[PDB]
Short mmCIF file of C-alpha atoms and ligand atoms in Angstrom, two decimals:
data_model
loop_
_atom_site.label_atom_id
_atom_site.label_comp_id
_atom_site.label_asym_id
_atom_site.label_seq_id
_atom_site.Cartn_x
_atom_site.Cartn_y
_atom_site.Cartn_z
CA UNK A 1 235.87 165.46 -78.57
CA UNK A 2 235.22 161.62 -79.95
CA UNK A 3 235.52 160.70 -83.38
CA UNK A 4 235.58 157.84 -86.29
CA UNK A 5 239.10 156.76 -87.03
CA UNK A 6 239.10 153.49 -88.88
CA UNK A 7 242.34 150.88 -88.87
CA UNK A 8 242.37 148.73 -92.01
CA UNK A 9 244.33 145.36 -91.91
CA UNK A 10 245.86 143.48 -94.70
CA UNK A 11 242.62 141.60 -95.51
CA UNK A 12 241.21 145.08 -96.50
CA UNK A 13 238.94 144.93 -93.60
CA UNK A 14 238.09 148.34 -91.94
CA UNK A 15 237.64 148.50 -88.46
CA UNK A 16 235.61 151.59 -87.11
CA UNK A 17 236.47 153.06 -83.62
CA UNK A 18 235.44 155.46 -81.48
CA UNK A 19 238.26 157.61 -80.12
CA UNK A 20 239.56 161.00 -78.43
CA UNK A 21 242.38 162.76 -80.12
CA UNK A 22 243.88 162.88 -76.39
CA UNK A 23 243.84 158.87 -76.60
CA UNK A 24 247.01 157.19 -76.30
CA UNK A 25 248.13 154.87 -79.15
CA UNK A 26 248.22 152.01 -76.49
CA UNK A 27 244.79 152.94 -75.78
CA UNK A 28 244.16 152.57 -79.38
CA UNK A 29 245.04 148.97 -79.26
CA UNK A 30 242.81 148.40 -76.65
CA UNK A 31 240.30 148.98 -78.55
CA UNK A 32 241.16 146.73 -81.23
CA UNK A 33 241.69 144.11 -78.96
CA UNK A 34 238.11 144.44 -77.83
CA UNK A 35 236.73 144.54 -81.74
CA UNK A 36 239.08 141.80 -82.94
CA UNK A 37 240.41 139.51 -80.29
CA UNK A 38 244.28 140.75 -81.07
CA UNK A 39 246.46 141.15 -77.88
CA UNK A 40 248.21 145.13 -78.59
CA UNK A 41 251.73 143.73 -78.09
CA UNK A 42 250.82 141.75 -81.17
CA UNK A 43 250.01 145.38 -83.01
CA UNK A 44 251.68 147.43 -85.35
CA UNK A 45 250.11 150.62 -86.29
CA UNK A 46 251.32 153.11 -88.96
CA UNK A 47 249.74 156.22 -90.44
CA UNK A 48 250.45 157.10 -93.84
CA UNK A 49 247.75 159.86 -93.95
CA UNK A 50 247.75 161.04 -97.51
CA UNK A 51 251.16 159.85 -98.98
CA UNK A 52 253.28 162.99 -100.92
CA UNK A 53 253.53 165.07 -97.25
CA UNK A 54 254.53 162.90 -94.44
CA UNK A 55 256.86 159.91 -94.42
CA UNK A 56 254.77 157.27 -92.97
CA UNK A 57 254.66 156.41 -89.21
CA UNK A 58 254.95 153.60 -86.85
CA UNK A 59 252.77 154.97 -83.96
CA UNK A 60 254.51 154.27 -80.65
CA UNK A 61 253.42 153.35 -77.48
CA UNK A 62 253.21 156.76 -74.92
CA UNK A 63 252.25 158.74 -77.76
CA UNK A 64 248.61 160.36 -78.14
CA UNK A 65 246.85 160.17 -81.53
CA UNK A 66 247.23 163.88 -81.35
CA UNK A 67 251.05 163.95 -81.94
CA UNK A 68 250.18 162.05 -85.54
CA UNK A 69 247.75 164.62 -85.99
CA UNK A 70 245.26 161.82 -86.75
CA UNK A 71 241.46 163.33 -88.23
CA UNK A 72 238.18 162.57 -88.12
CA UNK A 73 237.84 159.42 -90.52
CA UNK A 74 241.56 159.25 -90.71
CA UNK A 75 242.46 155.22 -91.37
CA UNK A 76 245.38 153.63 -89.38
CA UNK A 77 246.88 150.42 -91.26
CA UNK A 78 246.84 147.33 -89.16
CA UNK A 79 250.09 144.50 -88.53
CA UNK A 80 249.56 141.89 -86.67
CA UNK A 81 252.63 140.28 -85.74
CA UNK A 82 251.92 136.38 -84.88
CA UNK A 83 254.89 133.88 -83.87
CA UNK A 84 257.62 136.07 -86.16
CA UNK A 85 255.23 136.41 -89.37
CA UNK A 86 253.10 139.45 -90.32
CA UNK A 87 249.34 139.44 -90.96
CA UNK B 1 292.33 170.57 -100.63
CA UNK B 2 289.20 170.79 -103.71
CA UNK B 3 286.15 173.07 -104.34
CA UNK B 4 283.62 172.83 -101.99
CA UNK B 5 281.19 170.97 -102.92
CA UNK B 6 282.42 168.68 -105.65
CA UNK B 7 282.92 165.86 -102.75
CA UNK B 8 281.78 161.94 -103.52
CA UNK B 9 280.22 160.05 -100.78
CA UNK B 10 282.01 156.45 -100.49
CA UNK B 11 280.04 154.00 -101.41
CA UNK B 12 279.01 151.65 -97.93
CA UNK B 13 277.03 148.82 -99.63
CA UNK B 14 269.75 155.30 -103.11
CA UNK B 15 271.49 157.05 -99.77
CA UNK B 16 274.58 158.89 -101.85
CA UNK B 17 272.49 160.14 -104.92
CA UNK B 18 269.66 161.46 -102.61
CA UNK B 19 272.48 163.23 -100.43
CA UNK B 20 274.17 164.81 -103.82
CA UNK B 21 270.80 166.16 -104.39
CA UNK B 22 269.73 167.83 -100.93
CA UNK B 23 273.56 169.31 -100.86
CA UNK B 24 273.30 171.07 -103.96
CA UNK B 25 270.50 172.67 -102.68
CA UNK B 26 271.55 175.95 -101.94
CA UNK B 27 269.31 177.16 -99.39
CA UNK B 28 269.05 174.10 -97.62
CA UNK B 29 272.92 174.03 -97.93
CA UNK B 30 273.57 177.50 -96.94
CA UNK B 31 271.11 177.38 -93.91
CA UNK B 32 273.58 174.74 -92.44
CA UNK B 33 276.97 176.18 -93.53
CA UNK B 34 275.78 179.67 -92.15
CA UNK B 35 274.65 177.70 -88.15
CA UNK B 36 271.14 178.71 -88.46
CA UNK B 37 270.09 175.39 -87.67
CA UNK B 38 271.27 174.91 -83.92
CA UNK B 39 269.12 177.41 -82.52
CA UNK B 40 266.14 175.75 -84.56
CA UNK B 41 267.36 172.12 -83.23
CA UNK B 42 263.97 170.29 -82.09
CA UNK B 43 265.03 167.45 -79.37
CA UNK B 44 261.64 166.46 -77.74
CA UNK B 45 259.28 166.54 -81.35
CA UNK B 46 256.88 163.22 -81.21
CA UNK B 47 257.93 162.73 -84.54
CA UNK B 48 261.28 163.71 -84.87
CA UNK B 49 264.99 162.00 -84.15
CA UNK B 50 265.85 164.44 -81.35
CA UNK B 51 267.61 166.65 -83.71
CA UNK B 52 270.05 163.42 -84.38
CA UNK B 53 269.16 163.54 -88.17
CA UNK B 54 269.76 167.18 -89.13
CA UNK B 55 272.94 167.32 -86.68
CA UNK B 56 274.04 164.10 -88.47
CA UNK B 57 273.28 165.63 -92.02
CA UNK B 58 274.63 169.00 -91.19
CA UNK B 59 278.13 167.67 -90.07
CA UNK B 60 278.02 165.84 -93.31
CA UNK B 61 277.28 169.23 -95.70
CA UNK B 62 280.05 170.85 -93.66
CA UNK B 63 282.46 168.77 -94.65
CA UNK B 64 281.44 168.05 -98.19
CA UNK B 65 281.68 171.90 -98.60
CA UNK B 66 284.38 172.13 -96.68
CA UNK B 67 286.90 172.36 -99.43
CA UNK B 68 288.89 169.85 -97.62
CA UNK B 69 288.02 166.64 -99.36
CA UNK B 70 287.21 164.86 -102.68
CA UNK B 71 285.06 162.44 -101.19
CA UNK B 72 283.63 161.42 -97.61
CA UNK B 73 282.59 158.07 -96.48
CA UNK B 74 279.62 159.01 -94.77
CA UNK B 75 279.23 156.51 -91.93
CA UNK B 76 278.05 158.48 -89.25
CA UNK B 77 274.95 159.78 -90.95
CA UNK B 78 274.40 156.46 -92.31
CA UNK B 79 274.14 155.09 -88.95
CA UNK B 80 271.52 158.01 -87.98
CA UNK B 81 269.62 156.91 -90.66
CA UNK B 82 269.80 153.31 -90.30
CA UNK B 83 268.97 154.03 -85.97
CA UNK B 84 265.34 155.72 -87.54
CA UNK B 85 264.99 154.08 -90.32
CA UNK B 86 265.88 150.31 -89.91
CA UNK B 87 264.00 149.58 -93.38
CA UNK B 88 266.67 151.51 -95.37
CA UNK B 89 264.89 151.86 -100.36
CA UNK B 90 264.07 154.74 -103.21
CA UNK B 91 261.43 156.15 -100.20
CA UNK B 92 264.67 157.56 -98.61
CA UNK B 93 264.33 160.81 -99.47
CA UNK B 94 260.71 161.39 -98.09
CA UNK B 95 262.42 160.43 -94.92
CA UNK B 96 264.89 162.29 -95.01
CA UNK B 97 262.49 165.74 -95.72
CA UNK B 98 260.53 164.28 -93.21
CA UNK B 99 263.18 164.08 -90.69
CA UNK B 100 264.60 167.02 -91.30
CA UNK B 101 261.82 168.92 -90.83
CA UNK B 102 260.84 167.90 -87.66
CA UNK B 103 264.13 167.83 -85.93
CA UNK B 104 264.24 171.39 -87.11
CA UNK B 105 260.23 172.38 -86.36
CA UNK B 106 260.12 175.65 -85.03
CA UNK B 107 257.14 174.61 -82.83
CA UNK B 108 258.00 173.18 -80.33
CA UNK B 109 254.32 172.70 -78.59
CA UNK B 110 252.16 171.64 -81.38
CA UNK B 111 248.37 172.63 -81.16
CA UNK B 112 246.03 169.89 -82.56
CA UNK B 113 243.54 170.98 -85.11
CA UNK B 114 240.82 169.60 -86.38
CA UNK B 115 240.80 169.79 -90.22
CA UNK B 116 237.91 170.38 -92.55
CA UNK B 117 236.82 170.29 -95.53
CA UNK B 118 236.05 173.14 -98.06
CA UNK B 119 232.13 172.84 -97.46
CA UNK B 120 231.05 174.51 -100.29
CA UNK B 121 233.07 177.74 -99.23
CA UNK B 122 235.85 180.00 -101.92
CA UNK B 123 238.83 177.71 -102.55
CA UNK B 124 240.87 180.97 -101.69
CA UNK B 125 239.43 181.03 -98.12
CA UNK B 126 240.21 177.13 -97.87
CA UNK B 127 243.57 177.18 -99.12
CA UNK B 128 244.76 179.54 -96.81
CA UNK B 129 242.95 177.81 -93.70
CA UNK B 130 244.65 174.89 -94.77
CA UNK B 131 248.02 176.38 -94.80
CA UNK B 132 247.58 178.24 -91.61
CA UNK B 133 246.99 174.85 -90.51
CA UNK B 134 249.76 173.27 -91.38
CA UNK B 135 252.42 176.11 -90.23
CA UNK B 136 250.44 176.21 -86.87
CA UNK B 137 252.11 172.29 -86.62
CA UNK B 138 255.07 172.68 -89.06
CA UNK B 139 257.00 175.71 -89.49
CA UNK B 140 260.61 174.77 -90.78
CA UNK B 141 263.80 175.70 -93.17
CA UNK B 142 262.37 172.57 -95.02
CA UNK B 143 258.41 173.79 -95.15
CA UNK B 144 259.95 177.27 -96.23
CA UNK B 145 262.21 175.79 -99.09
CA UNK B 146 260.54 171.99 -99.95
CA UNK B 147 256.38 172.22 -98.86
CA UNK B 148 253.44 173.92 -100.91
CA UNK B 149 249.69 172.65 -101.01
CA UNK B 150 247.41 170.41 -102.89
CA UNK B 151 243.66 171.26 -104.14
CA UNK B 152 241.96 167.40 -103.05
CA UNK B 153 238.41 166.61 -104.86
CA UNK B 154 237.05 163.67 -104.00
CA UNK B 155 233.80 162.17 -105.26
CA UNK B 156 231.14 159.86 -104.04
CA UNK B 157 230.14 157.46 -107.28
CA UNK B 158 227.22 156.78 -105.41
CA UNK B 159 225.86 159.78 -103.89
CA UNK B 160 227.79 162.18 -106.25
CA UNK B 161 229.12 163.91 -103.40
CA UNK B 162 232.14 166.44 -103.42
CA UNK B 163 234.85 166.47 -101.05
CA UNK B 164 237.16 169.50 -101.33
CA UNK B 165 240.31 169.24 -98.78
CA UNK B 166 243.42 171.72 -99.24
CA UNK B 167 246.25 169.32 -98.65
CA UNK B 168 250.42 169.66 -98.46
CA UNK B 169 253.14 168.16 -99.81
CA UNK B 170 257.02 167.89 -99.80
CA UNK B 171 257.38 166.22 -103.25
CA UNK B 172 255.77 165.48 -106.33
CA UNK B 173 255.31 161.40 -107.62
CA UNK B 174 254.38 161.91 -111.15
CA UNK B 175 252.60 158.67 -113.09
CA UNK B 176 254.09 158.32 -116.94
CA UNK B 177 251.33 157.03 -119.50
CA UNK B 178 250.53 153.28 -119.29
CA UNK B 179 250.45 151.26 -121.56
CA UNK B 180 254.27 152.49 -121.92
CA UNK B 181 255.81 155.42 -124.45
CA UNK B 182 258.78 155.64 -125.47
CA UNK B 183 259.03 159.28 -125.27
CA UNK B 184 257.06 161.72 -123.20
CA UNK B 185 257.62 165.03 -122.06
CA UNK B 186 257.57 166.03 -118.17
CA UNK B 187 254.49 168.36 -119.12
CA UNK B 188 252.22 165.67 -119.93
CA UNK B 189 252.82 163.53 -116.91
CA UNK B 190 252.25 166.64 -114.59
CA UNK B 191 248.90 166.85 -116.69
CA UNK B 192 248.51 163.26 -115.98
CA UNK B 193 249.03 163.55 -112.61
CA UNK B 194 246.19 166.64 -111.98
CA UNK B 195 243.75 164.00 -114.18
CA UNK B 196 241.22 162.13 -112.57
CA UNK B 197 241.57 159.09 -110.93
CA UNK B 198 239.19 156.45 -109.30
CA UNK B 199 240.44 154.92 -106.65
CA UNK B 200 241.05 150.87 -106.34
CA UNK B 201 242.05 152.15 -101.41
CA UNK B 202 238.36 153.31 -101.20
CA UNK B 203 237.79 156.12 -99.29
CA UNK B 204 235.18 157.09 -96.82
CA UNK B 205 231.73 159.12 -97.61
CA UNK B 206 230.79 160.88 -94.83
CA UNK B 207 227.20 160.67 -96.39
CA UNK B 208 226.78 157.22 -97.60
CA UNK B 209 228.75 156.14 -94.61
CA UNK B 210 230.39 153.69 -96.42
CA UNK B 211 233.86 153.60 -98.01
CA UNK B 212 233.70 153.79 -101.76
CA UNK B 213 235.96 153.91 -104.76
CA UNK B 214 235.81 157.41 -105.21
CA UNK B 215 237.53 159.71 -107.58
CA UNK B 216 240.32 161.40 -106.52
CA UNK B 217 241.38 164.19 -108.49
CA UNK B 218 244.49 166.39 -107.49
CA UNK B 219 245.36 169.98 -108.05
CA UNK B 220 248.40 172.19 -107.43
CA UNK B 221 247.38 174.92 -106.03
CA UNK B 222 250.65 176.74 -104.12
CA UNK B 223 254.37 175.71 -105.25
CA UNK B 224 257.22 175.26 -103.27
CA UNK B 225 261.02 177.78 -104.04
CA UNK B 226 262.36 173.95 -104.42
CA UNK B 227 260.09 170.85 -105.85
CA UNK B 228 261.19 167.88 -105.69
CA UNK B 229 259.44 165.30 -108.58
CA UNK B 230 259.48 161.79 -108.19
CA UNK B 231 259.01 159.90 -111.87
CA UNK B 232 257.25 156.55 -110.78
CA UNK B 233 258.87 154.23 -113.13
CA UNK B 234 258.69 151.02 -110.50
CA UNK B 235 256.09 149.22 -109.14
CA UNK B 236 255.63 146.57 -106.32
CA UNK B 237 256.87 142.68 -107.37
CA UNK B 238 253.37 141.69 -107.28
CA UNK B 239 252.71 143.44 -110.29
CA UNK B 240 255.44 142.24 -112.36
CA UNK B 241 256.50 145.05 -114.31
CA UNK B 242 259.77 146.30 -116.06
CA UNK B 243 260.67 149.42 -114.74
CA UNK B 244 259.67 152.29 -117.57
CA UNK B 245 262.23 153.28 -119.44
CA UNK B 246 260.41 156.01 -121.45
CA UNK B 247 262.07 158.85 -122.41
CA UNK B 248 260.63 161.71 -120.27
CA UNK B 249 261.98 164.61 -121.30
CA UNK B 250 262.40 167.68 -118.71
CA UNK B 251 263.60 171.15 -119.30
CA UNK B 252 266.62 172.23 -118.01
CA UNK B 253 265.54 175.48 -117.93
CA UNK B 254 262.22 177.09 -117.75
CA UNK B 255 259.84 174.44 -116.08
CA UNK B 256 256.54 175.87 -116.50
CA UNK B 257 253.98 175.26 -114.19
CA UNK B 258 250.63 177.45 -112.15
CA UNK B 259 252.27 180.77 -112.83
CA UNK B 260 255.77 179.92 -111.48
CA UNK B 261 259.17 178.83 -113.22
CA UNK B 262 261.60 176.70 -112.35
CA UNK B 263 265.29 175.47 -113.51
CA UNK B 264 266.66 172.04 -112.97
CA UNK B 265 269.36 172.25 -110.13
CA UNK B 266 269.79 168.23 -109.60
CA UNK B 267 268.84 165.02 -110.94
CA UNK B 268 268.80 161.10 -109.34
CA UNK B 269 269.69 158.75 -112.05
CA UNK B 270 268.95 155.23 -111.47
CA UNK B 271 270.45 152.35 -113.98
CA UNK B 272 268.31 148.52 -113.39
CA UNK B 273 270.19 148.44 -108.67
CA UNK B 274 272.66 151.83 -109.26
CA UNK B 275 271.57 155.53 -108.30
CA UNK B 276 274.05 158.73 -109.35
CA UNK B 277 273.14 162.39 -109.41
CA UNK B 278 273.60 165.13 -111.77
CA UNK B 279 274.12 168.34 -110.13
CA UNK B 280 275.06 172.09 -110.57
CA UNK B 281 276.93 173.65 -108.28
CA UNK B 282 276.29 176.44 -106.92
CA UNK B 283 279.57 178.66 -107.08
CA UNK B 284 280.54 177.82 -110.71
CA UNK B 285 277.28 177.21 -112.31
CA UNK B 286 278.79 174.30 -114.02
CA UNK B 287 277.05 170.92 -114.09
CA UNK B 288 278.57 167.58 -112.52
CA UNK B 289 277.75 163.80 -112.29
CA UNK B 290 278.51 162.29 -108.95
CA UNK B 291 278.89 158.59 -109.01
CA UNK B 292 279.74 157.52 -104.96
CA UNK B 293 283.12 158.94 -104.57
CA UNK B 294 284.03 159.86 -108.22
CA UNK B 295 283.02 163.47 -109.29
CA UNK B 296 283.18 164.88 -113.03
CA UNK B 297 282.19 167.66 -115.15
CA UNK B 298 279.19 167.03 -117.05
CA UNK B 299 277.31 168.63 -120.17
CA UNK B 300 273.65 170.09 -119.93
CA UNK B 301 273.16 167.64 -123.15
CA UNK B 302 273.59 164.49 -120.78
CA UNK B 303 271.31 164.80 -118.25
CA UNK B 304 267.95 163.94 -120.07
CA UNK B 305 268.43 160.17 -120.01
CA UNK B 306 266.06 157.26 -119.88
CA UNK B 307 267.78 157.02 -115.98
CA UNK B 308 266.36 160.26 -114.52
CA UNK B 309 264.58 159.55 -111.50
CA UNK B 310 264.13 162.55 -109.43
CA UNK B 311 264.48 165.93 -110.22
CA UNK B 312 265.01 168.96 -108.58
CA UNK B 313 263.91 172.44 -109.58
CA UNK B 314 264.54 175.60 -107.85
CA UNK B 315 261.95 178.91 -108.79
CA UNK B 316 263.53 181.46 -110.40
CA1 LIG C 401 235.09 140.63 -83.95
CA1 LIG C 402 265.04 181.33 -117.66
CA1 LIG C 403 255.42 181.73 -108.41
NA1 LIG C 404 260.13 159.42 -84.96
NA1 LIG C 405 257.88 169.56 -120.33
ZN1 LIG C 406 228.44 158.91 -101.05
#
């Protein structure tokens, strides 16, 4: 079942996807690479959900966004990494 | 040869204090000393350490309440950490809850769910959706001793819409009153803490389909046998802030709070930098400081300092 997820980077900009819980978190980049131009090896993606229950999480590669437990309007945070610096 | 349980942790250049803390908790600490944790051992968990972290911290408990030493040097949990969580500073402990739970998560096949919110429906009914929820994805020695459940109300300043979620936690970060006290007691910043807040970190509408700065405003609604109560005295460089050095003063006995009581069993100190840990142990009562590898008796009358940084309560 598809759903809004949005991925914020450190400009505050919120990108809006369209994606199945079943999706893959290198699917995920894909789709950020086709919104924004950013290559996925280039991507870092945690989710903090709501802070005070999980310890935040870098979301690796092989893993579906269903192992996060990611929601409907849940918002990933964004790092591109470009030549060894952090955007 | 010493008591079990008075046992320093060598300093290796937060980790010792948070570790005096967990260890003089004694369910967590009996759990492990009594091997109920290898049949609960989670290797495969997405989001676990493939049981590395609580075999790591359990080999550590058993010797510090082994009886056998004054102090460890605790290397080989140190590297467990430092393998899955390169980053490691005062955040250590919500990885460490973290980890613990889910290389000990009793499920083993996690269903997804797809959360809701309240909808206008009993917060009774929601509540207990939420937490059947959560244990249908977490069901561990650490949800059973550490997790209970927030009441979330969000609203739209726009559209004056009310978002009602049911959320968990593991620990408590309580603000302390800006512009800065001197003295304040731990009642008032758990009051603070359930006040209203607009967010800076907007927050979606579902109606206006936009994100706004909403107001968040937080409720506890079911308490753990252990919380765990962060005082947020720091703040990122950006901000360029002295650390708060008010006085917040918190019972030693006879917390107070949604029905339930609760008695201080542990306390981080940090000095502006250094981290120790007040603690009482379990099979004398009596209270100790733990400062790395030296370990003293201590007074009730000295742990309510300007240094407390977390505290631990267990219900009575
Ligand atoms: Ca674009
Ligand atoms: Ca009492
Ligand atoms: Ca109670
Ligand atoms: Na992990
Ligand atoms: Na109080
Ligand atoms: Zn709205």
């Amino acid at each position: 079942a598809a759903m809004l997820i949005f991925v914020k980077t450190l400009s505050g900009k919120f990108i809006s996807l369209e994606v199945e819980p079943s999706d893959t978190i290198e699917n995920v980049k894909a789709k950020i690479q086709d919104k924004e131009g950013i290559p996925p090896d280039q991507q870092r993606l945690i989710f903090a959900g709501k802070r005070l229950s999980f310890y935040r999480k870098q979301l690796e590669d092989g893993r579906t966004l269903s192992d996060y437990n990611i929601q409907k309007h849940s918002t990933l945070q964004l790092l591109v990494i470009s030549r060894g610096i952090l955007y | 040869n010493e008591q079990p349980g008075l046992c320093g942790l060598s300093n290796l250049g937060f980790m010792n204090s948070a570790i005096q803390c967990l260890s003089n908790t004694p369910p967590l600490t009996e759990y492990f000393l009594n091997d109920k944790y290898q049949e609960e051992l989670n290797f495969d968990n997405p989001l676990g350490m493939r049981g590395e972290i609580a075999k790591s911290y359990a080999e550590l408990i058993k010797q510090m309440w082994s009886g056998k030493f004054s102090y460890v040097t605790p290397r080989a949990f140190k590297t467990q950490v430092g393998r899955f969580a390169p980053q490691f500073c005062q955040e250590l402990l919500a990885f460490l809850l973290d980890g613990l739970h889910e290389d000990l998560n009793r499920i083993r096949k996690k269903p997804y769910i797809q959360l809701k919110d309240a909808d206008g429906r009993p917060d009774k009914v929601v509540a207990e959706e939420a937490w059947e929820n959560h244990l249908k994805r977490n069901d561990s020695i650490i949800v059973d001793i550490f997790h209970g459940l927030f009441k979330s109300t969000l609203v739209c300043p726009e559209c004056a819409k009310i978002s009602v979620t049911f959320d968990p936690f593991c620990y408590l970060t309580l603000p302390l009153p800006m512009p800065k006290k001197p003295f304040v007691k731990l009642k008032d910043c758990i009051e603070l803490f359930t006040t209203k807040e607009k967010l800076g970190d907007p927050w979606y509408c579902p109606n206006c389909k936009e994100h706004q700065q909403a107001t968040k405003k937080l409720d506890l609604w079911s308490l753990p046998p252990v919380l765990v109560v962060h005082l947020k005295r720091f703040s990122y460089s950006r901000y360029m802030r002295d650390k708060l050095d008010t006085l917040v003063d918190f019972p030693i006995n006879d917390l107070d709070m949604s029905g339930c009581r609760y008695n201080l069993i542990a306390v981080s100190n940090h000095y502006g930098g250094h981290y120790t840990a007040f603690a009482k142990n379990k099979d004398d009562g009596k209270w100790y400081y733990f400062d790395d590898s030296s370990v003293s008796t201590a007074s009730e009358d000295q742990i309510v300092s300007k240094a407390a940084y977390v505290l631990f309560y267990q219900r009575q």
